[PDB]
Design a binder for this molecule. Structure first.
Ligand code: CA
Ligand code: CA
Length: 213
């Protein structure tokens, strides 16, 4: 059912439809053209054909911004390459014997790098490997809004590890807000989780807690 497309275009003038249809894959562009009112059809195609001779000023402006946005992505992504994030992602994907060997050597040789990589490897579910005191320390820094949102994207064992580390009442209160907030978007769960991730990272940066490995 493409139809919502047809109504969008139905009430436009031929040159605007020609401009709109030209940024599509031609089979899609044809399906839409075929469904447009019969009286508009021939003239839309004529305008599509003659579009590189008329050449609207809007087309160049669309390219001038398409160009800049793709350019900037390329510059932000590839001007510097590698780094601590890359290193962390690689270690998370290595076989356990290899990553223990690499981490073991870095604890001897360059201990602060090992720590940087350790912090950067941490991912939300790694809270399960934190000890109770560490979790308790993390909780007195995170607010209940941020925590509840973050757990809406969590497994039971994770939720349980949190519940065991708060007062018997505040656990029951937390369980309640999780039941009654409902619809939340992935984006909001991610940054809530990331807010917590940074707190865990800052606390280990200060030597307040240990991240297991
Ligand atoms: Ca980079
Ligand atoms: Ca440190």
């Amino acid at each position: 059912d493409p139809v919502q497309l047809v109504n969008f275009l139905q009430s436009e003038h031929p040159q605007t439809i020609a401009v709109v249809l030209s940024y599509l894959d031609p089979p899609v562009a044809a399906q839409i053209l075929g469904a447009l009112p019969e009286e508009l059809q021939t003239e839309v195609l004529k305008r599509i054909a003659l579009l590189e001779r008329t050449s609207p000023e809007v087309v160049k402006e669309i390219e001038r911004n398409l160009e800049k946005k793709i350019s900037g992505f390329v510059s932000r992504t590839f001007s510097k390459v590698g780094g601590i994030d890359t290193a962390a992602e690689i270690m998370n994907n290595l076989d356990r014997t290899t990553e223990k060997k690499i981490m073991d050597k870095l604890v001897q040789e360059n201990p602060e790098l090992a720590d940087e990589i350790r912090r950067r490897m941490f991912v939300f579910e790694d809270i399960l490997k934190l000890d109770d005191r560490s979790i308790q320390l993390v909780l007195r820094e995170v607010d209940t809004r941020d925590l509840a949102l973050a757990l809406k994207g969590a497994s039971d064992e994770l939720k349980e590890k949190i519940f065991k580390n708060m007062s018997k009442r505040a656990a029951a209160l937390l369980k309640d807000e999780l039941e009654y907030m409902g619809p939340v978007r992935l984006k909001d769960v991610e940054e809530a989780q990331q807010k917590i991730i940074n707190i865990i990272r800052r606390l280990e940066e200060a030597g307040e807690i240990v991240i297991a490995r």
